[PDB]
Design a protein around this nucleic acid. Structure first.
Length: 135
RNA sequence: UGGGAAAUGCUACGCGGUAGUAGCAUGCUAGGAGCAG
């Protein structure tokens, strides 16, 4: 037969490929969440200036810009920490930021998967934990 | 007339080598089993 696509199982680099794909999904959810917030009601200038610079570096500038890449990566490390196995993830994220939609949430992931993978994540499958004593 | 070396044995000490014994740690290999995505 002819396999249209998708990963096989019996090769040697499946776990690493899935991990990279997972990280890409998370980062693009964060980018989408940040750019769809009205800039007239943001917090201290820093983040709103960051949003402006982000749109510029995304759609206007042609080649790569190293410093802003470093800055955004540092921001993500500050407010969005991930531990990643092959397609299994746990995220510890600042809640007050996600309240105003400055970082990801489950609705952003649902939208990203719907338009980038052609599957519909049902929110009854994910889980959200408020306490930190229990892991 | 206020001058002494070696060959033998004993004992003690240390080193070296040899063997045997025991312990410790590790590195490899092989075998078998279990868990996870």
């Amino acid at each position: 037969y002819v396999k249209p696509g998708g990963t096989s199982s019996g090769d040697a680099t499946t776990a690493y490929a899935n991990s990279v794909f997972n990280i890409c999904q998370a980062v693009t959810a964060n980018v989408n969440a940040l750019l769809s917030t009205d800039g007239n009601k943001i917090a201290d200038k820093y983040v709103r200036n960051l949003q402006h610079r982000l749109y510029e570096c995304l759609y206007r500038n042609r080649d790569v810009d190293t410093d802003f890449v470093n800055e955004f990566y540092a921001y993500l490390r500050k407010h969005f920490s991930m531990m990643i196995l092959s397609d299994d993830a746990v995220v510890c994220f600042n809640s007050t930021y996600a309240s105003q939609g400055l970082v990801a949430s489950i609705k952003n992931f649902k939208s990203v998967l719907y338009y980038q993978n052609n599957v519909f994540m049902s929110e009854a499958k994910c889980w959200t934990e408020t306490d930190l004593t229990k892991g």
